[PDB]
């Protein structure tokens with residue numbers, strides 16, 4: 001009985017879902033708990049994710 005116990009280690013230990021919004025280009029410091037996508041201060045204020053319960057990444 002064999003098994004594909006082969007894989008590569010994942011280094012980093014740092015968040016990446018807080019880069020920059022490709023819309024307003026603002027430091028992503030919030031995450032829409034309604035769309036499940038990282039957003040920026042502008043996005044949150046934007047009616048787009050304004051009504052959505054956004055949280056501080």
Ligand SMILES: [Zn+2]
Nearest residue numbers: 021024040043
């Ligand atoms: Zn934005």
Ligand SMILES: [Zn+2]
Nearest residue numbers: 032035049052
């Ligand atoms: Zn949203």
